[PDB]
Design a protein around this ligand. Structure first.
Ligand SMILES: *[C@@H]1O[C@H](CO)[C@@H](O[C@@H]2O[C@H](CO)[C@@H](O[C@@H]3O[C@H](CO[C@H]4O[C@H](CO[C@H]5O[C@H](CO)[C@@H](O)[C@H](O)[C@@H]5O)[C@@H](O)[C@H](O[C@H]5O[C@H](CO)[C@@H](O)[C@H](O)[C@@H]5O)[C@@H]4O)[C@@H](O)[C@H](O[C@H]4O[C@H](CO)[C@@H](O)[C@H](O)[C@@H]4O[C@H]4O[C@H](CO)[C@@H](O)[C@H](O)[C@@H]4O[C@H]4O[C@H](CO)[C@@H](O)[C@H](O)[C@@H]4O)[C@@H]3O)[C@H](O)[C@H]2NC(C)=O)[C@H](O)[C@H]1NC(C)=O
Ligand SMILES: *[C@@H]1O[C@H](CO)[C@@H](O[C@@H]2O[C@H](CO)[C@@H](O[C@@H]3O[C@H](CO[C@H]4O[C@H](CO[C@H]5O[C@H](CO)[C@@H](O)[C@H](O)[C@@H]5O)[C@@H](O)[C@H](O[C@H]5O[C@H](CO)[C@@H](O)[C@H](O)[C@@H]5O)[C@@H]4O)[C@@H](O)[C@H](O[C@H]4O[C@H](CO)[C@@H](O)[C@H](O)[C@@H]4O[C@H]4O[C@H](CO)[C@@H](O)[C@H](O)[C@@H]4O[C@H]4O[C@H](CO)[C@@H](O)[C@H](O)[C@@H]4O)[C@@H]3O)[C@H](O)[C@H]2NC(C)=O)[C@H](O)[C@H]1NC(C)=O
Ligand SMILES: *[C@@H]1O[C@H](CO)[C@@H](O[C@@H]2O[C@H](CO)[C@@H](O[C@@H]3O[C@H](CO[C@H]4O[C@H](CO[C@H]5O[C@H](CO)[C@@H](O)[C@H](O)[C@@H]5O)[C@@H](O)[C@H](O[C@H]5O[C@H](CO)[C@@H](O)[C@H](O)[C@@H]5O)[C@@H]4O)[C@@H](O)[C@H](O[C@H]4O[C@H](CO)[C@@H](O)[C@H](O)[C@@H]4O[C@H]4O[C@H](CO)[C@@H](O)[C@H](O)[C@@H]4O[C@H]4O[C@H](CO)[C@@H](O)[C@H](O)[C@@H]4O)[C@@H]3O)[C@H](O)[C@H]2NC(C)=O)[C@H](O)[C@H]1NC(C)=O
Ligand SMILES: *[C@@H]1O[C@H](CO)[C@@H](O[C@@H]2O[C@H](CO)[C@@H](O[C@@H]3O[C@H](CO[C@H]4O[C@H](CO[C@H]5O[C@H](CO)[C@@H](O)[C@H](O)[C@@H]5O)[C@@H](O)[C@H](O[C@H]5O[C@H](CO)[C@@H](O)[C@H](O)[C@@H]5O)[C@@H]4O)[C@@H](O)[C@H](O[C@H]4O[C@H](CO)[C@@H](O)[C@H](O)[C@@H]4O[C@H]4O[C@H](CO)[C@@H](O)[C@H](O)[C@@H]4O[C@H]4O[C@H](CO)[C@@H](O)[C@H](O)[C@@H]4O)[C@@H]3O)[C@H](O)[C@H]2NC(C)=O)[C@H](O)[C@H]1NC(C)=O
Ligand SMILES: COCCNC(=O)O[C@@H]([C@@H]1OC(C(=O)O)=C[C@H](NC(=N)N)[C@H]1NC(C)=O)[C@H](O)CO
Ligand SMILES: COCCNC(=O)O[C@@H]([C@@H]1OC(C(=O)O)=C[C@H](NC(=N)N)[C@H]1NC(C)=O)[C@H](O)CO
Ligand SMILES: [Ca+2]
Ligand SMILES: [Ca+2]
Ligand SMILES: [Ca+2]
Ligand SMILES: [Ca+2]
Lengths: 388, 388, 388, 388
C-alpha cells in the first residue's frame, strides 16, 4: 500500500444518483439502532462506510430521552457498513467524543475525536486504530472540528479546528497530520471571518473546504489548502446563491470577502463542489429551517459574485426534514476522474418534532453522474406517531 | 482471479434436492428480520448468498404496515448468508432501489438497482461495490429489470431491461456490461411480444433467459443471448405446458412465436432450464393464483409445441403460498457440469392474507440431482395468527 | 493445506476439564436464540464450533410451540462460534434437514443433511459449502445418521447411516466419502444387532464409533472402521457398565455380541473412548430418564465383559436434565496426542418440563486432562418459571 | 510473527486521555447486552479488545436476578470489540470460569479461566484458542487469579495466582507459561503478606504487578517479575498515598514491607505505574466505598515512604460508582515508548443500588498523554429508575 495522491480532477457533474440510504429511524422503531447525529461518509481503499456520533443509547431505549443534547460523555464516533443502519451490533467505535473527523491516507485511517467540558476539551488523534497524538483546547471554549471526512495527500491530512466563540471572533487552526503525528499547524488567514464544521474534498488543484460562518454570515466561507506546502487561504463563496441556514433570500450580488448579513448566531453544516463551470452548491430548500435539500449548478460560484443557477436537482422535499450535509469521495475508485459525492443528514425528533423526547437521524447519500438522470426525492420515511 | 467462462453444459437433471431455506417469516415473528420481496440467489467464487429487495423495516416493526407497495424510497437490494434470514444485522446493502439484478463475473460482482418515480427512474450500475455507470429511463414508465441474477462470460454480463407499458407494447433493451461499463445495448428483437423479469442461466451454448409476458401471454417468452457476439434472439416456450400465473389450462398445442391467450395484464416471474431432453419447467400449481410450485420434465419444451411432461416433482403444495421464482447456478463449483438451481419466493401477508398489514416472504431453493430423489414439500411455515 | 492423517494416539485421560458451555436457554429467555436439539461440536484446522439442528424459530418466538417434534421442513444444521449461543444473527447454515453429521478433512468441511417425509427421505452431501452428492432412502423408513461429527483420514471420511425400523432389524450402511464424493458403501457386518446415531473419533488404530441400539440393547454397539481399507467390524461394549438410557441396573457380566436386555424400543445417543486401560465411558446417571451425566474409567470396557469402574467424574447432577452426548477431538491441536473431548446436550422443555410448549437445549463440553482435576457439575441453568 | 520483547520504557505521563468507553448499561437497558463484571482490556498485535466475566444472561433478561453472585457455572471470559458493549451477538468466549487473565505473546493469545466449587477449583490454560495445560487447586480454597491482562516477554508470560484464605495467610504462586505450557512456578517470596488480583505491565526493566492485600493491608502489594530469569520479588508501595478501598486516611509515612492497617478483610482490584519520577497511582476517591476515581502523580511512590502527589486528574466523580481497575498497554504500537493505559470498572446495581436485582458494569478506559490535557469526568451514565 502507498499513500494516496490527489492526481485527478472532478468528474463532470450532469446530475446526481442515489448512492446510499440507511433508513435508520424507520428500522430503529423496532430494532437496536443507536441514536446518532452529525453523520458522514468516508472511504477506505477497499470499503466505504457510514459514520456518525452515537449518543450511547438506542432510539427505543429509555436513555434516548434528552438526546437533543450535543456534548455528553456517552457519545462516540462510530462507523458501520454502507447503507446499513447504525446498530449496537454492527457499529465500530472509532474514538470517544462529541465532535469528529476521519479519513484514510491510502495506508491507514486517521480518526479524531474531541471530548471534555466546554472550557477544557481535548482532541485525540487516532491512526491505524491507535491513539497517536493529542491536542488541548487553546481557547477554552468548545474545541470543535469538521463532522465530516478529512482528505489526505501523500500521507498529509489537513484538518480544520475551531476553538472560541460561536457568536463572535474565534480561534481557527488548520492542522497538518501524517500517520497521526502533528507536522504543522497554523492560524486561520484570509478573509473568512468565522469558521465551523468544514466539508472538504481533494482534487489535483488541492484541497477545498466549504464551511459554516456561525457568527454573521449566510454565505459559506471557503478554505483552500495546499497539502504539500501545508499552507491555506480563505474567503467566502462569491455567489449570491446563499447556502447557509437559516439565511436571507438570494440577492443578485454576493460577497467574496465578508459575511453576507441578515442572520446571526446560527447556521448549518453544508458543502459545495467548486470547479469552474462544473460547480454545484448544496442547500436546504427552506430559508428558515433545516428542511428540504437541493443541488444547484452555479458556474464559477466561488469567484463570481453575480453567478446564478443554470441547472438543479431536488434531493429532499421542503416538506421533509433535512439537516447537516457534507462532502466525501471514493479516492480509490477506477477511472480518470474523482466522482463527487455527498450525504444529507435527515434529522428526526427534537426540536422540530417534540412529541418524542429524542433527537436522531438517518442518512441519504448521492454521487454525481455524467448522465442527466431523472430526479426523485428522499425522505427519512419514519412516522413519528409510531414512536408515541 | 480470471473472468469466468461458460465452458460446461448442464448436469443431467433426474430430480431436485433441497439447497436452501431461510424460514424468514417464522423467525421474523420474534427477531429483527427485514421485510422483503422479489428475492433471489447468486454465487461468488467463494460464497453463495440470498438476495432480495428490502422494504426498510422489520416485520414486527410498525413500518411494515403498507409493504404491499412495490416502489418506495425505503427499498434496497440486500444480500445475506445462504439460508440465514435477512436481518437488520447480517444484511449487506448492494444498492438502493426497487428493481434489481446482480452477478459475479469471476473477478468482481456487478449489482444494478433502479430507483425514482414512475416517469423518471434510473438504473445505477455498481461494480466491485462502487457505482460505475448510470442509465436514465428511456420510456418514462417504470424502468425495470430482472429481479434475479444475471450471467457473465469472459467479463461480459448481459442484462434485460424493460421500460414502458405493463399492458401493451413496451421498450425492452438488452444491455451488455463489462466491469460495470456499458459495452453495447440493443432493442428487443425476435418474436417475443412483451418482456419482464427475465430469469437467466449460462452454459456452453450461451445464455438463456426465461421471462414473463405481462400483456397477453401465459406461455413464457425466452431470450437467448450470445455474450461474445453480444446479440440475441427471442421467442416463447413452444410447449403447451404453460408456466405463467394466472394462466389458462394446458392445451395440446402451444405457441412458439406469439402469446398464448386467455389471461391479460398479469403474470409472475418464473424460470426454466431449456436443454433438449434434459428440459425442466417450473410453475405454480394453481392456474389462478400464486400458490403451490412444481417442476416438470418436458423434453424439448422450447422448440416442441406438442411437448408434455414425462416426469415431475412437487416443491410446494398448492395449499401453500408461493410467488416469484428464478434461476441461478454455482458457476464456480467443481466437476464437469453446471448444476441447475432455482429459488421460490414464498409470499406471506397481503393481498392473500390480509389479517396482517404487511407483505413479505421467505425463500426456499433447490438444485438438481443426477439421482432420482424422494420428494418433500416446502411451506413457508409461519402461522399468520401469531402476528395478530 | 493437506488432508489430515490420524497419526496420534489418545492422550492419557486422568480427568476432564471444562471446554465449552453456551448457556443458550438462559440467554434465550431474552435474546434471539434459535430453538435447537441434537447438538454437537466439530473442529476446523483454525477453529472449533458448536453445531445443532435448528427448529427455524427462536425460543421466545411463538413458533417455538410444538418444537418437541423431530422432523419438520423448518430444521437445518447450523454452526456458530464456540460457547456462543445459537442466535439468529451468528448462526451459519450448513445444510437443510433434520438429521446430520459434519467433519473437516484438513482441507475442507463435509456436511450432510437428511430431509424429506418418513418414506421418502434423502441425504445431501455438501463439501466446501457446495452440494456434491445425494443419497436416496433405501428402506423408505426415516433415513437417519449420526447427529455428531464424522472423522476423516487422508481425505476419506466414513459416515454411518441407518434406514428402517426403530424397533426391529434395520438397514445400516457405512458410507466412505472423499471431497463429498461417494467412494464406497457397505452394509453393516459384525455382531451389532441395531445401529443409530454413532459417535465417532479417530486415532492411529483407526476410527471408533459408539452408537445406540434402539431395539433391544442397553449396552452400546461399537463400529470400528478402517478408513484406508474402507472396511469395518461391529460388536457391543463388553462391559457390564451399561451406558444407554433408559437401561437396566449394571450386572457383573456384560454382552459382547448381543443386546443386553431389559429395555426395548428406546435409547439415547451416547459415546465412549475405547483405549485399553485408558478407557472412559459416558452415561446418564439416571437409569430411567435423560438426567445427570457421568464419566467412568472402565479399563478394557470394549473387550472385557467383567470390567468395572476404577475412577469417575460427575459432569451433570442427576437432579439436572441432560440428553444426547457425543465425541469430537481437535485433530489440528499441537502436541503428540489427541485430546479426547465430548459434549452433553442439556434438554429443557418438553416432554419433561411441559409448563412450556417448546423443546430446546444448551450445550456443555469437556476435554480430557492428564492432571487429576477437581470436579464441578454443569447444569443448563435456566429457570423454566421465567418462560411462563 | 515473532514473540514480543519488552524493549521500551514508559512514555512520559503528563495527563490522561479518553481511550475507550462502552456505555454498556445505558445501551443494555434496551439491547441484548450480557451482564458482566471484572472487566479489563488487552491488545493483540492488530487489535485491542474489551474483556470481562459474563454472567450468562442479558441485563433485561430475568436471569439477571442474582448476578451479584461471584462464581456460578454460567460465567465465562468473553472479549468484544473496543468500546462496543458486550452483546450476545458480538462477544467471543475465551474460556469458561469465574476468574481469569489473558495476554498475547506476539504470536498468539494465552487465556486462563478458573472454574469449580470453592474446595475443588481448577485453571485451564488456553493458547491460540485451544486448551493446552491445566492446574488443580493446591489449597482447596477458591483458586483465583488476576482479572486483568498478563504480560509476556520472548514467549514467556508470568501469571500470579492465589489459593487459600481471603482473610489470612494464603498460598500465592507465580506461574511462568510459554505457548500455554508450564515452564516453572514458584511460591510467593518477598515482604508482601497477602496477594489478590494483580494488575501488571511490562517495560524494559521487567514486569511490574500491583495487587490487592485483602487481609490487613490498605497499601497495595507489588510483585516485580524477571521474565527471563523467571524470578520475582515482592513488597508494598512505600507511599503514604494509600490506594486500596476501603482504606484509612492518608498518613505521612507509608509502609514498604508490611500491610498498612485500619481496614481488614476487604479491598478492591487496582493498579499503578511505578516509574521513578514518572509514577502515577490510581485509586477510588471515596475511602469508604467503590465510588469515584482519580490518578495521582506520586514521584518514587514505590520506594519513598514519604512521597506525596504533585499532580493529578479526576477520572470519575465521587458521586458516581466505580469499581475494579487495572493496567494494560498496546505493546505493538509505533514509537519509542510504551503508552501507559488503564480501565475502570463502573459497577451498577447491587449491592449499592438494590432497587434492581442485578449487578453489572460498564467500562471506561484512559491512556497517558505527553500533553497536559484538560480533564473531564466519565460516569457510567445509566439511570437505574429506567430499569424498574
Ligand atoms: C425528470 O427529472 C429531470 C431531471 O432532474 C427533471 O428536469 C429537471 O427539472 C428541474 C426542475 O425544473 C430543473 O431544476 C431547476 O433548474 C433551474 C435552472 O434551469 C432553468 O434556468 C436555466 C438558466 O436560465 C437563465 O440563464 C440562461 C443562460 O443562457 C438563459 O438562457 C435564460 O433565459 C435564463 O436567463 C435555463 O438554462 C434552463 O433551461 C434549460 O433547462 C430546461 C429544463 O429545466 C429546458 O426546458 C430548456 O430547454 C433548457 O435546456 C431552465 O430554464 C433552477 O433555476 C431551479 O432552481 C430554482 O428553482 C427551485 C424551485 O423549483 C428553487 O428551489 C431553487 O432554489 C431555485 O430557485 C431559487 O433560487 C433562484 C436563484 O437565486 C432564485 O432566482 C429563485 O427565485 C428561487 O429563489 C427563491 O427560493 C429559494 C429556495 O427556497 C430561496 O432560497 C430564495 O431566497 C427565494 O425564496 C431548478 O433547480 C433541472 O435543471 C432539470 N434538469 C434537467 C436535466 O432538465 C424533469 O423535470 C423530470 N421530469 C418530470 C416529468 O418530472
Ligand atoms: C417418493 O418420491 C418420488 C420422487 O419424487 C415419487 O415419485 C414421483 O411421483 C410423482 C407423482 O406421481 C411423479 O410426478 C408426476 O409425473 C408425471 C409424469 O410421469 C407419468 O407420465 C409419464 C409420461 O407418460 C406418457 O408418456 C409416455 C411416453 O413413453 C407413455 O409411455 C405413457 O403411456 C404416457 O403417454 C410416464 O412415463 C410415467 O411413468 C413412469 O413413472 C412412473 C412413476 O411416476 C412409474 O410407475 C412408471 O413405471 C414409469 O417409470 C408416469 O406415468 C406428471 O405427468 C405429473 O405431473 C402432472 O400431474 C400433477 C398432479 O400430480 C400436476 O400438478 C402436473 O401439473 C401434471 O398434471 C397437469 O399437467 C398435464 C400436462 O399438461 C395435464 O395433462 C394434466 O391433466 C394436469 O393438468 C391440470 O393441472 C395443471 C396443474 O394445476 C393445470 O395447470 C392444468 O391446466 C390442468 O388443470 C407428475 O409430475 C414423479 O415423476 C415421480 N418420480 C419418480 C422418479 O418416480 C414417489 O411417488 C414418492 N413415493 C411416495 C410413496 O410418495
Ligand atoms: C474434588 O474432585 C475430585 C476429582 O473429581 C474428587 O475425587 C473423585 O471423587 C469421585 C467421587 O467419589 C470419584 O468417582 C468415583 O470413583 C469410583 C471408583 O473409585 C473407587 O473405586 C476404585 C475401584 O475399587 C475397586 O477396585 C480396586 C482395584 O484395585 C480395589 O482396590 C478396590 O478394593 C475395589 O475392588 C478404587 O480404586 C478407588 O480408590 C482410589 O480412589 C479413592 C478416591 O476416589 C482414594 O481415596 C483411594 O485411596 C484410591 O486412590 C475408589 O475407591 C466409582 O466407582 C464411582 O462411580 C460409582 O459411584 C457413582 C456414585 O458416586 C455412580 O454414579 C457410578 O455410576 C458408580 O456407581 C454405580 O456403578 C457401579 C459399577 O457398575 C455399581 O457397582 C454401583 O453400585 C453403582 O450402580 C448404581 O448406580 C448407577 C448409576 O445410577 C446405576 O446405573 C446402577 O444400575 C446402580 O443403580 C465414582 O465415579 C473419583 O474417582 C475421584 N477422583 C479422584 C481423582 O480422586 C473429590 O472427591 C473432590 N473433593 C471434594 C472434597 O468434593
Ligand atoms: C482543566 O483541566 C486541567 C487538567 O486536568 C486542570 O488542572 C488540574 O487541576 C487539578 C485539580 O486542581 C489538579 O489536580 C490536583 O493536583 C494536586 C497537586 O498539585 C498541587 O500541589 C503540587 C504539590 O505542591 C506541594 O509540593 C510542591 C513541591 O515543589 C511545593 O511547591 C508546594 O508548596 C507543596 O508543598 C503543586 O506543585 C501544584 O502546583 C502546580 O499546579 C497548579 C495547578 O494544579 C498551578 O497553579 C501551579 O502554578 C503549579 O504549576 C498544585 O498546587 C493534588 O494534590 C490534588 O489531589 C488532591 O486533591 C484531590 C481533591 O481535589 C483529592 O481527591 C486527592 O486525593 C488529593 O487530596 C488528598 O490526598 C492528599 C495526599 O495524601 C492529602 O494531602 C489531601 O488532604 C487529600 O486527602 C483526603 O482526600 C483523599 C481522597 O478522598 C482521602 O483518601 C484522604 O484520606 C483525605 O481524606 C489534585 O490531584 C491537576 O494537577 C491540574 N493539572 C494541571 C496540568 O494543571 C484545570 O483545573 C481544569 N480547568 C478548569 C477551569 O477546570
Ligand atoms: C400497473 O402496474 C404498474 C406498477 N406495477 C408493476 O410495475 O408491477 C410489476 C412488478 O410486479 C410485481 C408483482 O408481484 O406482481 C412485483 C414487482 N415489484 C418490484 N418492486 N419490483 C413489480 N415491479 C415494479 C417495478 O414495481 C409487474 O411486472 C407489471 O409491470
Ligand atoms: C469470603 O469470600 C470468599 C468469596 N469471595 C471472593 O472470592 O471474593 C474475592 C473477589 O471479590 C470480588 C469483589 O468485587 O470484591 C469479586 C471477585 N469475583 C470474581 N468472580 N472473580 C471475587 N473473586 C472470586 C474468585 O470470587 C475477594 O477478592 C476475596 O478473596
Ligand atoms: Ca450563519
Ligand atoms: Ca402473463
Ligand atoms: Ca436401547
Ligand atoms: Ca485491603
Amino acid at each position: 500500500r502507498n499513500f494516496n495522491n490527489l492526481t485527478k480532477g472532478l468528474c463532470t457533474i450532469n446530475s446526481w444518483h442515489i448512492y446510499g440510504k440507511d433508513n435508520a429511524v424507520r428500522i430503529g422503531e423496532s430494532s437496536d439502532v443507536l441514536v446518532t447525529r452529525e453523520p458522514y461518509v468516508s472511504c477506505d481503499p477497499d470499503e466505504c462506510r457510514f459514520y456518525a456520533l452515537s449518543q450511547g443509547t438506542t432510539i427505543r431505549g429509555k436513555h434516548s430521552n434528552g438526546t437533543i443534547h450535543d456534548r455528553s460523555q456517552y457519545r462516540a464516533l462510530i462507523s458501520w457498513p454502507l447503507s446499513s443502519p447504525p446498530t449496537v451490533y454492527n457499529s465500530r467505535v472509532e474514538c470517544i467524543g462529541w465532535s469528529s473527523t476521519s479519513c484514510h491516507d491510502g495506508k491507514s485511517r486517521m480518526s479524531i475525536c474531541i471530548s471534555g467540558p466546554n472550557n477544557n476539551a481535548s482532541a485525540v488523534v487516532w491512526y491505524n486504530r491507535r491513539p497517536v497524538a493529542e491536542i488541548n483546547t487553546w481557547a477554552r471554549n468548545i474545541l470543535r472540528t469538521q463532522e465530516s471526512e478529512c482528505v489526505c495527500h501523500n500521507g498529509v491530512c489537513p484538518v480544520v479546528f475551531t476553538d472560541g466563540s460561536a457568536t463572535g471572533p474565534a480561534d481557527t487552526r488548520i492542522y497538518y497530520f501524517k500517520e497521526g503525528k502533528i507536522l504543522k499547524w497554523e492560524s486561520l488567514t484570509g478573509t473568512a471571518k468565522h469558521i465551523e464544521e468544514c466539508s472538504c474534498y481533494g482534487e489535483r488543484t488541492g484541497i477545498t473546504c466549504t464551511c459554516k460562518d456561525n457568527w454573521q454570515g449566510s454565505n459559506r466561507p471557503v478554505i483552500q489548502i495546499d497539502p504539500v506546502a501545508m499552507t491555506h487561504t480563505s474567503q467566502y463563496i462569491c455567489s449570491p446563491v446563499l447556502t447557509d441556514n437559516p439565511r436571507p433570500n438570494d440577492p443578485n450580488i454576493g460577497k467574496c470577502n465578508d459575511p453576507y448579513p441578515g442572520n446571526n448566531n446560527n447556521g448549518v453544516k453544508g458543502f459545495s463542489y467548486l470547479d469552474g463551470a462544473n460547480t454545484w452548491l448544496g442547500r436546504t430548500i427552506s430559508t428558515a429551517s433545516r428542511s428540504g435539500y437541493e443541488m444547484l449548478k452555479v458556474p464559477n460560484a466561488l469567484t463570481d459574485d453575480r453567478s446564478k443557477p443554470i441547472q438543479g436537482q431536488t434531493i429532499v422535499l421542503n416538506a421533509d426534514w433535512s439537516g447537516y450535509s457534507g462532502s466525501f469521495m471514493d479516492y480509490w475508485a477506477e477511472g480518470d476522474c474523482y466522482r463527487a459525492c455527498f450525504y444529507v443528514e435527515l434529522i428526526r425528533g427534537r426540536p422540530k418534532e417534540d412529541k418524542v423526547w429524542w433527537t436522531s437521524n438517518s442518512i441519504v447519500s448521492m454521487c454525481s453522474s455524467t448522465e442527466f438522470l431523472g430526479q426523485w426525492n428522499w425522505p427519512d420515511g419514519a412516522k413519528i406517531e409510531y414512536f408515541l
